[PDB]
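Q: what does this look like with nickel (II) ion bound?
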Amino acid sequence: LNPEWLARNNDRRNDHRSPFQRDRARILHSAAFRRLQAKTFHRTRLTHSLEAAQIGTGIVAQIKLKQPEFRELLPSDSLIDSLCLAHDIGHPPYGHGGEIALNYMMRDHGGFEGNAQTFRIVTSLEPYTEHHGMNLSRRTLLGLLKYPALLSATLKAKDWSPAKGIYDCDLASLDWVLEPLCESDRELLGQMTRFKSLDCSIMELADDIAYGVHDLEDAIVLGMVTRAQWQEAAAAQLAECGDPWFEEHIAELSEMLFSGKHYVRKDAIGGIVNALLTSISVKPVEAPFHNELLAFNAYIEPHMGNALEVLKHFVSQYVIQIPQVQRFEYKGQQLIMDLFEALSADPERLLPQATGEKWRKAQEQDEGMRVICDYIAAMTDAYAQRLHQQLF
Amino acid sequence: NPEWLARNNRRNDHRSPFQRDRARILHSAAFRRLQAKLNDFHRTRLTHSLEAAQIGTGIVAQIKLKQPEFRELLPSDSLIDSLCLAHDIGHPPYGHGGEIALNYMMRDHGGFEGNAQTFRIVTSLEPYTEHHGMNLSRRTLLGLLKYPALLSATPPPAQLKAKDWSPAKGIYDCDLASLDWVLEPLCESDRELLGQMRRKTRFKSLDCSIMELADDIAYGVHDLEDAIVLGMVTRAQWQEAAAAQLAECGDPWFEEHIAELSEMLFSGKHYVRKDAIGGIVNALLTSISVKPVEAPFHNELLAFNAYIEPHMGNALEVLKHFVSQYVIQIPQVQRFEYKGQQLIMDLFEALSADPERLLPQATGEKWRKAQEQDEGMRVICDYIAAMTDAYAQRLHQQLF
Ligand code: NI
Ligand code: NI
């Protein structure tokens, strides 16, 4: 593979780390990563990303054990770590409700979307360097493009959900990452999005497994799920999902999940995680890609995938789509819209002096609204709440 | 004897003495206060008392059908109503936690106890009359003597432990005049037997045995439904605790019906759960009869009590123990009581630091008058005992 994938956008003797170990190091020290401790028993988006990173390195170890052909093509541990630790930095306060509020406010100025924001943070907003954000290696950035097209190409929540892609205001740093690809590879990547790099496919499965399994254990202990509804929703569907392992073991997994002892539940959760993780292989992507990082993706075996989708659907139906969580997101989306409306009413007067200055400079190219959106996107829930109390 | 219709003290008012007692209790400030003591749950001591009253009248109806011999002796509807409406009047803020605090703070002045407080409210404190409280008829008062002895008949030393300061049960010595009046038409032999101990009193009147059964049935069953929907008990815990014990309790109806009763209670539909509750209540009511008391009492209101059939008693005791294990003896409830008992003890120590200066003016005046007999502490105790939780919280904030 080309050494141009190890390059950074901008340029000690004792530091002999790989480029991906330096990327992992920057992501860990960043303010964008540390704030995931605020954004949501102590399960946070930070905790979720750590769990995803552990599943992601487990996926790689398991692939390079059964498919030695790819041992050199697979991402190193610190690269797959970096994509899982950074994947969620772009999420705003109040999650999906916050995303909707911002996207509506920015409807006439490029929109808002969490994956777009993540790319925007690592290429510009995180102040590790003056002009290139965290200035990550090119392959790391390519791994973060879950949707490698621009959004120009791609109180009711359904209408305002954002499309997925990269902001047009970040096209320069998108051009830089895709630069060492032949034209034909580049033309396909924006095809509809349908495609993504090998490293990013591994990260997506790790996020999917973490979402499916690690939210589940604390939902059982908190009583948000009863034994009866687990049987009616998840356990019955897993008996008919078509994967033999889940069909065989679901009954005993359910008795372990309701054991009432953590050291027994841990065995169920680990066995599910291990079963999904050991069910992934690298196959060639069905497109005439030339670059090996785009010609191969990691895929979960289809039947195991049905089991994973039963698990994600169950977590969304009994942990996220319950009125108590959805009312909190409604409140957050009203709160964000209040903040956006007050701040844009008189920005140079209400923004903090550092952000007010970036607003005046950004208004020379009429990009002031994006400066306000970045600022709100970078708030924690508590910061956004005190600002609301200050203004109102 | 018509002496049971007499009071201590209009043309068109043709109500019975017991109908007038019921109306007074319904109108009293003491009764209205039971309403104070994200869901839509509003079960209070007031609702508990309405449900007891309705079970009480149902018990009387079953006895007057199965035992006509006793139709002259059984209480009228409004008498059994009156005893269930009033039974919880004396409870202090914070339930048992308040009771422990007041009793400890009155350790040298007669103690505090809720049943004693109930007697004190209806015979003196509730200002319906100037000198005799609600001025209820003698038989109504007798029905309220769940423990017809003085606390002198029924010390701990040494942060506070609940076991060490739970009050004995009885009547305050400062209310002896009103107790002497209630027991006056009894022969001496009945009177010295009534205060007999099992200290714990052993005996009570027929009207009061009925109220006790209705109260126990209300406590057993009507707490049970909302415990289920609030998630305070799961199906599994119901099976291990209540349902298994009821399958071995010895009463044939419960052993036969428990499986179907458990599926109805966890149906998730109010219109199905109420039929389980109604059947449990009805199975318990229809198992009560009047039998003679095992003591040579001469007065008919003391010679007979109502008793529940023993195997049925086991079923009721399973239900009462179950609500105590999953609705009351949980840390969430017990911490609220600990806080309340710390709160009550603070108010008492501040108010007794200087009562004239800190009490409301009307209570301050009662405190000055009571000091001619050196009973000032009981005035502070009545005042705290009649507060709601919200009033106590507000008074505490003004002081701390
Ligand atoms: Ni994620
Ligand atoms: Ni009661």
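The interface with chain B takes residues 223, 226-228 of chain A (CB under 8 Å). The longest strand of chain A covers residues 280-284.
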